[PDB]
Amino acid sequence: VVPFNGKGTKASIKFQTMVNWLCENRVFTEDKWKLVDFNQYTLLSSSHSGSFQIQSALKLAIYKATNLVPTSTFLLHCIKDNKIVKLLLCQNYDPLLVGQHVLKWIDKKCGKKNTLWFYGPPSTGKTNLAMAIAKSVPVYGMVNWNNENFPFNDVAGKSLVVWDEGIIKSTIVEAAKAILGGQPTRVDQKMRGVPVVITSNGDITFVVSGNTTTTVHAKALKERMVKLNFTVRCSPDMGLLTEADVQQWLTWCNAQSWDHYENWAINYTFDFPGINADALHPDLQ
Amino acid sequence: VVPFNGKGTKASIKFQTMVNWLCENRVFTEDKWKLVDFNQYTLLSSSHSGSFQIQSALKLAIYKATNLVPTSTFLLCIKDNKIVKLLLCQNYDPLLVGQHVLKWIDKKCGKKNTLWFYGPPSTGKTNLAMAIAKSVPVYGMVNWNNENFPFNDVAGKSLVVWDEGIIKSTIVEAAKAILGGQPTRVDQKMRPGVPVVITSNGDITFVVSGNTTTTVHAKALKERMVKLNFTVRCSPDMGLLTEADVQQWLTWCNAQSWDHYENWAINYTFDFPGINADALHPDLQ
Amino acid sequence: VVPFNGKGTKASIKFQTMVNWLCENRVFTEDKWKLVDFNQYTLLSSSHSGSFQIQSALKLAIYKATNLVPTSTFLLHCIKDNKIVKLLLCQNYDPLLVGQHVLKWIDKKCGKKNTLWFYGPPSTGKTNLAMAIAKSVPVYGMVNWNNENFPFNDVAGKSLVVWDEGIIKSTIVEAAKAILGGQPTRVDQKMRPGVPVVITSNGDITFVVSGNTTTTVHAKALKERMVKLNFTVRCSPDMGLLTEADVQQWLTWCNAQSWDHYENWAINYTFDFPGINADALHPDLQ
Amino acid sequence: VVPFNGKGTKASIKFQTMVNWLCENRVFTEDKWKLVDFNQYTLLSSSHSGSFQIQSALKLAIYKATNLVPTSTFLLHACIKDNKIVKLLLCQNYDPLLVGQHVLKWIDKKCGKKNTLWFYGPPSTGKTNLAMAIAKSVPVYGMVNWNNENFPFNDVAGKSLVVWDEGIIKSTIVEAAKAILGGQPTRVDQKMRGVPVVITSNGDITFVVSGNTTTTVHAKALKERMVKLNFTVRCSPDMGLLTEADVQQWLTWCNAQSWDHYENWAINYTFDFPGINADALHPDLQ
Ligand SMILES: Nc1ncnc2c1ncn2[C@@H]1O[C@H](COP(=O)(O)OP(=O)(O)NP(=O)(O)O)[C@@H](O)[C@H]1O
Ligand SMILES: Nc1ncnc2c1ncn2[C@@H]1O[C@H](COP(=O)(O)OP(=O)(O)NP(=O)(O)O)[C@@H](O)[C@H]1O
Ligand SMILES: Nc1ncnc2c1ncn2[C@@H]1O[C@H](COP(=O)(O)OP(=O)(O)NP(=O)(O)O)[C@@H](O)[C@H]1O
Ligand SMILES: Nc1ncnc2c1ncn2[C@@H]1O[C@H](COP(=O)(O)OP(=O)(O)NP(=O)(O)O)[C@@H](O)[C@H]1O
Ligand SMILES: [Mg+2]
Ligand SMILES: [Mg+2]
Ligand SMILES: [Mg+2]
Ligand SMILES: [Mg+2]
């Protein structure tokens, strides 16, 4: 398609540069804007013709970082010193293979399997890892914040959705399968998928119907999930994980060979394969 | 009727050019505009008087492509084509089917405004429906609309799709109007017929009423439908039929002789006739 | 368990004989009592005490014919000339095998497959055969009488449930599966065996209505509970109404013959009803 | 079917006698009993054990005169030109004998689907007078005008005749009206277990009302269930009111004559009723 012949004035052009400035600094909310740059926020809000541009610039900045720029481009900025690499080795999982899946999963390239699942006993790093990734994406939603009756609202404009320590009820089991499967919502189709990560101590394939466990949806939920078993406690020295840990870890994994990935990626298994001593990278051996 | 004499200004002329640009590139929604041309969208939304033009232009662009211009103009080796293989495998004359679609999509079949695809599952019923539905300017689906109010938002569409449809007694009287091409009562007082395609694994002539099927409406529905039997299963690798195949197929059907179709057009039959080995046009014999 | 040692008076014994009389003559409703025995109905309703026995005797009479007696006994009592035998031959189904399956199905001995499904084009004897079976059992009720949003009320206390020209919606699809599979309703568990179901339809009922669409998520589950018969061959318009004498004669004849093939199939029930084997047909039907 | 051999006491026998007395003297309502026999009515209500017998007697009396005894017997009584009914039918160019032989079949539900009589024409032609005359003769009769507007067909069972004076059919009730006009029992009666109908009108009732608009979609289906008589010639102003004595005399006379003229018309039940043949009219009416 040929771009339109229209030419913008200096006021319109300066607005365009402001939209580009917002994306380049990851400023996607009004509260974030005030902290990052209060002088420009004060100047813009001086008039009704300027306070309008505050709303419009944020709606366009969100769209640019969500539907035009792939999310992985935000994640790409001694490997053994990185806390995430140590954590995945403590859980007996290959740090390279997990990292390569995250790049594919956050880009919605996995097809139906749009859902991750960190499963294990309490205090094993499940919430920390999930929140660390969520901090490194432009905008992320959360089921816990939403209404208890409509947990799957406000999914548009989110590059990621975090469902921490959640359980699937029968009243929302049908809406869950749509979101977990990456299928766009019926409302989205009429008015026109987001990666989902779940942490849990119990098996979420058991749907809560009334006061009774049900296993009707066991197969449907497994076709959409990839499960990681976090069954080993982490030393308290781990503390809180930073965004730079994710960026360093994912940048290294992207530059390595992908050959091991598509071999497993041909047959998407519900459970993530464990460590094999043959396929370990020499840097981690 | 002579057009109004008064000429416009530079600002209004540029808006008119933008409207003609939207129709050319088949941009009828804001999301389609952002994906195609984010630059012009950003500049327009720099002011209140600019974001007004975005809403005003799209409403005129949709109206131009639906009411002022015939839909067939947006629709426009022969054996190699996937669709003609699909039609021949079902033992239906490809020239007759293509010549019917052009007259049907233009709302010129009188009372028989509705096509119907019937047959066993996985025989390409929905695949062909989407191919035609994706080529028209704007298409709507009964699935998207509200469960108890399925025929809202039917104006402004070039085609309405009813996939896996079943006619309930609560909407059977509303369905008969839209199936026959009769304009809706609200459309009358705020002032016009849209083609409908139905794909179903079952005989939709059977109307559901409670926990029981009734045939009192069978004769009336047969007056408005045209039926195609997709009985033979197709190749497992048929693939997604695209806009290019529809444009190729209908263009060839338009070029050939129309005398054969007008014999059938004199009296419309509920069942669509099959191929005659000698009446088949020499490009396909 | 030993019955209680107590004995009744003259009045209590006469009431017991009245309850037995209702079962023999199949009087399970007041309207049936009025048609048959108006004299005894007039004598009983002459007082408030007597009118109580009318309501109470029907409760025990219906219960005896539904729980204390197998339903096959009320079905039992030239075979080629039987109209049902003619109907099953036109549709290419073995009369001996159909009858032998009905007897076990009407007695809830088929396990999961508690449902019979008749399918075919219109005017093929689907309702006729179903109605004849339905009117031969002591008490029958149809889904077509119940409320639209509560199709399965009054199911308990019946010998058969008929669902004529029926279709399954996603709102009741969960309630339907329990009854079709013979699983007792939740309310029955906390207030205390299912009821055999026969369904006739011109379309495929495995498809489940949801909104204005069709779905097959319940297609596999429903097939585990139903046995399907294909009523495709057009019948002669002068076949007429199938009667109880046709049903009783047909089932009694099937009960008399050997079951040898039936145990072979009954090892693993299939969804579709198997067709006729020309060599396995009984010589009395040849 | 052998009746139960239980024999009641003296008190129960007397109640049975009182049931036979109510049916004999056409006493079917509480008020009618007070007019006909106040001495017995006072005696029964002297105690609670007695005032219960009153309700049970009326329930059985209405049933015996509606569901067990044919209605035609009560229309019959236990110069023909002297009857004012024949005068009315002659003016409308209708053979008086053929009309009477039809009523004996229409009131007994024997006319198949064509269950409802329709009287049509300009005002003051005796449509209501004739219809109310037959209505007053049957044991128990109900009217649609008495029932509430939203549910016109409550309390239909237990009635020997339903009258619909100057009626109009709305689309909200057209589906329910089709069953009662066609003689089909309603859904309620089927689960808890045919009434002749007469309609008079100044206009075409087949024009079903729908909103502020008149539609003809149901006209063909309604015509399948009605018989029409066109009352056009205005009667003499001194017509008076038709009585049950005239209905009993006219209908009894029509029973005695031959039926071959009517039995031939029953071969094809047309919508309109045939007119007078100048030479086929019975000699007594000449
Ligand atoms: N805010 C924090 N500050 C310091 N250390 C933290 C913090 N959050 C988590 N940790 C450390 O991270 C490790 C596990 O934490 P966490 O991710 O919360 O496990 P968890 O599985 O989510 N607990 P649970 O929610 O019950 O499943 C421990 O070593 C904690 O000390
Ligand atoms: N997205 C797709 N990509 C490739 N092939 C497809 C796709 N969708 C359908 N097909 C093929 O199209 C053929 C028929 O599919 P489909 O159009 O879905 O039939 P269908 O009638 O819609 N099934 P049903 O809805 O149950 O009646 C098969 O050979 C499929 O493999
Ligand atoms: N009451 C009846 N009187 C006369 N013939 C009857 C009657 N009931 C059924 N038949 C005949 O029985 C045959 C099949 O009728 P029926 O059993 O009603 O098929 P059907 O499946 O119920 N029709 P449909 O509901 O459209 O599928 C036809 O030849 C009918 O004429
Ligand atoms: N109770 C009565 N006493 C005397 N004359 C009566 C009585 N009822 C009706 N008539 C007469 O009977 C004739 C016919 O009137 P009627 O039977 O009421 O027709 P109608 O159908 O009621 N008029 P309409 O309802 O407008 O079509 C008239 O001459 C009336 O005066
Ligand atoms: Mg946690
Ligand atoms: Mg499909
Ligand atoms: Mg039927
Ligand atoms: Mg009047």
Q: Cβ distance A228 to A93 under 8 Å? A: yes
* Beta carbons within 8 Å of C67's beta carbon, 6+ residues apart: C193
The nearest alpha carbon in chain D to C24 belongs to D1
Q: B50: helix, coil or strand?
A: helix
Nearest to A274 by CA among A126, A113, A89, A32: A89
- State the Cα–Cα distance between residues A174 and C279, nearest whole angstrom: 52
B284 lines ligand 2 (CB under 6 A): no
Q: Do D56 and C45 touch (CB under 8 A)?
A: yes
Atom of ligand 3 at shortest range from CA of C237: 29
Write the CA distances from B7 to A37, B64, B197, B245, integer angstroms: 47, 21, 43, 43
Whether chain B has a CB inside 8 Å of the CB on A64: the answer is: yes
Q: Cβ distance D97 to D282 under 8 Å? A: yes
Say which DSSP state A170 is in: G
- Which residues lie with the beta carbon below 6 Å from any ligand 4 atom? D 123-129, 166, 200, 202, 235, 237, 239-241
Q: What DSSP letter does each residue of D120-166 carry, written as one string?
A: ESSSSSSHHHHHHHHHHHSSSEEETTTS-SS-TTSS-TT-SEEEETT
User: What's the maximum distance between 2 C-alpha atoms anywhere in chain D?
Assistant: 66
The nearest alpha carbon in chain C to D6 belongs to C40
Helix (H), strand (E), coil (C) string for chain C: CCCCCCCCCHHHHHHHHHHHHHHHCCCCCHHHHHHHCHHHHHHHCCCHHHHHHHHHHHHHHHHHHHHHCCCHHHHCCCHHHCHHHHHHHHCCCCHHHHHHHHHHHHCCCCCCCCEEEEECCCCCCHHHHHHHHHCCCCCEEECCCCCCCCCCCCCCCCCEEEEECCCCECCCHHHHHHHHCCCCCHHHHHHCCCCCEEEEECCCCCCEEECCEEECCCHHHHHCCEEEEECCCCCCHHHCCCCHHHHHHHHHHHHHCCCHHHHHHHCCCCCECCCCCCCCCCCCCC
The 10 Å Cβ neighbour count of residue D263 is 11
- State the Cα–Cα distance between residues A61 and A18, nearest whole angstrom: 9
Say which DSSP state B223 is in: T
Nearest to C242 by CA among C130, C75, C95, C97: C130
From the CA of A218, how far away is ligand 2's center (Å)? 26
- Separation of CA A174 from chain center: 22
- State the Cα–Cα distance between residues D29 and D158, nearest whole angstrom: 13
Whether chain C has a CB inside 8 Å of the CB on B201: the answer is: yes
Residues of chain D found within 8 Å of residue C51, distances taken between Cβ atoms: 56
Say which DSSP state D65 is in: I
Whether chain C has a CB inside 8 Å of the CB on D56: the answer is: yes
End-to-end CA separation in angstroms for chain B: 51
Residues of chain D found within 8 Å of residue C10, distances taken between Cβ atoms: none
Residues of chain B found within 8 Å of residue C148, distances taken between Cβ atoms: 210-211
Nearest to B208 by CA among C227, C208, A202, D104: C208
Q: Cβ distance C118 to C200 under 8 Å? A: yes
The 10 Å Cβ neighbour count of residue D274 is 13
Method of determination is: cryo-EM
- State the Cα–Cα distance between residues C155 and C172, nearest whole angstrom: 15
Q: Cβ distance A258 to A100 under 8 Å? A: yes
CA angle B110, B111, B116 (to 5 degrees): 115
- State the Cα–Cα distance between residues A57 and A27, nearest whole angstrom: 10
Q: What are residue A179's DSSP bridge partners?
A: none
Nearest to A123 by CA among A169, A80, A91, A149: A91
Residue spans of alpha helices (H) in chain B: 10-24, 30-36, 38-44, 48-63, 72-75, 82-89, 94-105, 125-135, 172-179, 185-189, 218-222, 243-255, 259-265
Q: What DSSP letter does each residue of A46-64 carry, written as one string?
A: TSHHHHHHHHHHHHHHHHI
Nearest to A244 by CA among A141, A87, A126, A132: A132
Element (H, E) at B214: strand B213-214
Would the annotation count A199 as a binding residue?
A: no
B236 is written with which tokens? 């497992």
> Pairing state of beta strands B207-208 and B159-163?
unpaired
Write the CA distances from A177 to A170, A221, B44, B85, integer angstroms: 11, 7, 38, 36
Q: What is the residue with the minimal CA distance to atom 6 of ligand 1?
A: A239
C79 is written with which tokens? 């075979």
Nearest to C41 by CA among C24, C58, C59: C58
Q: Cβ distance A250 to A103 under 8 Å? A: yes
Element (H, E) at A12: helix A10-24
Nearest to B137 by CA among B196, B55, B73: B73
Q: Cβ distance A54 to A30 under 8 Å? A: yes
Element (H, E) at A163: strand A160-164
From the CA of C278, how far away is ligand 7's center (Å)? 30
Q: What is the residue with the minimal CA distance to atom 27 of ligand 1?
A: A122
The 10 Å Cβ neighbour count of residue B61 is 25
Q: Do D6 and C31 touch (CB under 8 A)?
A: no
End-to-end CA separation in angstroms for chain C: 51
Chain B meets chain C (3+ C-beta pairs below 8 A): yes
C124 lines ligand 3 (CB under 6 A): yes
C202 lines ligand 3 (CB under 6 A): yes
D148 is written with which tokens? 């509430």
Q: A209: helix, coil or strand?
A: strand
- State the Cα–Cα distance between residues B61 and A189, nearest whole angstrom: 20
Q: Do C212 and B163 touch (CB under 8 A)?
A: no
In this complex, which of B164, B211, B213 lies closest to C213 when CB atoms are compared?
B164
- State the Cα–Cα distance between residues D57 and B42, nearest whole angstrom: 89
* Beta carbons within 8 Å of C207's beta carbon, 6+ residues apart: B201, B202, C214, C215, C216, C219
Nearest to C90 by CA among C80, C105, C76, C75: C80
* Beta carbons within 8 Å of C88's beta carbon, 6+ residues apart: C94, C95, C98
Whether chain C has a CB inside 8 Å of the CB on D49: the answer is: yes
Burial class (CB in 10 A: 0-12, 13-18, 19+), C73: exposed
Helices vs strands, H then E, count in chain B: 13, 7
Q: Do D11 and C35 touch (CB under 8 A)?
A: no
- State the Cα–Cα distance between residues C128 and C118, nearest whole angstrom: 11
Q: B30: helix, coil or strand?
A: helix
Whether chain B has a CB inside 8 Å of the CB on C204: the answer is: yes
From the CA of A160, how far away is ligand 5's center (Å)? 17
* Orientation angle between helical segments C83-90 and C95-106, nearest 10 degrees: 110
Atom of ligand 3 at shortest range from CA of C131: 17
Binding residues of B for Mg(2+): 126, 163-164
Find tokens 């989205």 and name the residue. Answer: A188
Nearest to B99 by CA among B118, B126, B75: B75
Candidates B18, B31, B46, B141, partner chain A, best to mutate (most A CBs within 10 A): B46
Rg of chain A over CA atoms, in angstroms?
Answer: 21
Query: Resolution limit in angstroms?
Result: 3.5
- State the Cα–Cα distance between residues A16 and A51, nearest whole angstrom: 15
Q: Do A52 and B48 touch (CB under 8 A)?
A: yes
Residue C79 amino acid letter: I
Phi, psi angle pair for C208, to nearest 5°: -115, 130
Q: B40: helix, coil or strand?
A: helix
| Nearest-neighbour CA in chain B from A1: distance (Å) | 7
